[PDB]
Amino acid sequence: MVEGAVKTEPVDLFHPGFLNSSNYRIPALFKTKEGTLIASIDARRHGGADAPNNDIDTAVRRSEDGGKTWDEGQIIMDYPDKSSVIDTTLIEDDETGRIFLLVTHFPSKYGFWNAGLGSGFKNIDGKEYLCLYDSSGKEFTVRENVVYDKDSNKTEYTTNALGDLFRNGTKIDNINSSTAPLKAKGTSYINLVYSDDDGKTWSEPQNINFQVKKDWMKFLGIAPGRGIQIKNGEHKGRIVVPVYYTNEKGKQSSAVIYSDDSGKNWTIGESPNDNRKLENGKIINSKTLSDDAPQLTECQVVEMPNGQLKLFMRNLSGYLNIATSFDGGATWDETVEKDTNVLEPYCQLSVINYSQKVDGKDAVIFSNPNARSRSNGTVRIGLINQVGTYENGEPKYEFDWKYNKLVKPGYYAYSCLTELSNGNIGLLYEGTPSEEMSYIEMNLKYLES
Ligand SMILES: O=C(CO)N[C@H]1[C@H]([C@H](O)[C@H](O)CO)O[C@@](O)(C(=O)O)C[C@@H]1O
Ligand SMILES: [Ca+2]
Ligand SMILES: [Ca+2]
């Protein structure tokens, strides 16, 4: 290493036995406005396997000294009996100081492959209510935590936000378990929690599926890592959270959900697959997509100097795919770019804006496995250059991957970056499949060397 270069020796920020979890996957890492680092992760309690073959809880650690020391952690979401929360994402509303963590939630027995269609909510007279089902398949609704039957008679059952099921006020089970007399629909749900004390305490989960999941979506999940809050332009203040979904045919398409009211209400935008123009001119849609090749899956979003959004997406082309939005994530330009300078082995990636210019250019930082497998973990600095304009007159931005640094030889899978208070880069990465999750700090002198 050159003199002054910083690449800290890896710290196992999560590992077998921490919080009595045997396994860990899916890192998220975020520096709050106050300067605290929040790291979130799936505590996979029965091996590394994805839902439904596990019981997965959400864990958090905090650092108040720039990542040099970390607290003893806490579990912030835990559903019973193999109902899992998987794939976390972190963002903050800088106006209110509220930190958000969102995650995908499945009842017991459900996961990506067998999620049922739709939101799991039903409209009764203008409001969406979570449905519950008994053993005969009869449908009930939960209205302000009171269970009503199909004839709108109040039953003896109530619920709470965690899904506990109470009979005349006594807990008997939980609507997410394999044994409850009333169960939620077996599908994915987006859950949201928040902290107003810099990550020390967290709310109980809000189920926002009724706002963001459409009737024709089977799986709808958080794309893990981080979100953004838009800094420039007409959508300044919008909180943007990457997601992805499958249609009835099981084919995956990326999107973002977003909030213009500090996280109170959410909307899902279109996918880049909606009215996408494929390489030779075929027009597709995420609702009708029937082929594997154009799928767009996990993704992360960054903001260009004028506010334009770029969605970096896991896909099946072997290379990075990038979509562009002129309207704050509501829709995407018809052309998804393939960047053959950036291998993408079908794995989650991390990309963040960087606050200072590099070589006279606005820059982003990027992390993924630079290979055709989950290996050769590489952190890149991409310099933003405008190369002309679209037909609508908007600027066209391209990335120059000028610096590309191998940080993890051997296994490298999911990862998440953050800029640190000192201008350096923190990185939490899967350097093992599902055991030790490693944290390092790197400076730009190292990354450019
Ligand atoms: O299964 C889900 C969503 O419910 N998420 C997993 C996700 C999905 O299974 C995958 O993105 C679906 O194509 O991928 C991982 O299996 C992986 O590729 O390593 C890990 C991630 O937690
Ligand atoms: Ca649990
Ligand atoms: Ca489009």
Author numbering: 1242 to 1690
Relevant lines from the article:
The genomes of most C. perfringens strains contain three separate genes encoding highly conserved GH33 CAZymes targeting sialic acid glycosidic linkages: the nonsecreted 43 kDa NanH, and the two secreted 77 kDa NanI and 129 kDa NanJ. Here, we present the structural and biochemical characterization of the GH33 catalytic domains of the three sialidases of C. perfringens and probe their substrate specificity. The catalytically active domains, which we refer to as NanHGH33, NanJGH33, and NanIGH33, displayed differential activity on various naturally occurring forms of sialic acid. We report the X-ray crystal structures of these domains in complex with relevant sialic acid variants revealing the molecular basis of how each catalytic domain accommodates different sialic acids.
NanI possess an additional N-terminal family 40 carbohydrate binding module (CBM). However, Neu5Gc (and its alternately acetylated species) is a naturally occurring variant of sialic acid that is present in BSM and was released to some extent by all of the enzymes, though low abundance made it difficult to confidently assign the structures of the acetylated variants. We were able to generate a complex of NanIGH33 with Neu5Gc, which highlighted a “Gc pocket” that can accommodate the additional O11 hydroxyl group of Neu5Gc. This pocket also appears to be present in NanJGH33 and NanHGH33, which is consistent with their ability to release this monosaccharide. Based on the relative abundances of the released Neu5Gc variants, and comparison across the three enzymes, it appears that NanIGH33 is the least able at releasing Neu5Gc, whereas NanJGH33 may be marginally better than NanHGH33. NanIGH33 was most stringent being entirely unable to accommodate 7-O-Ac modification and was comparatively poor at hydrolyzing Neu5Gc variants.
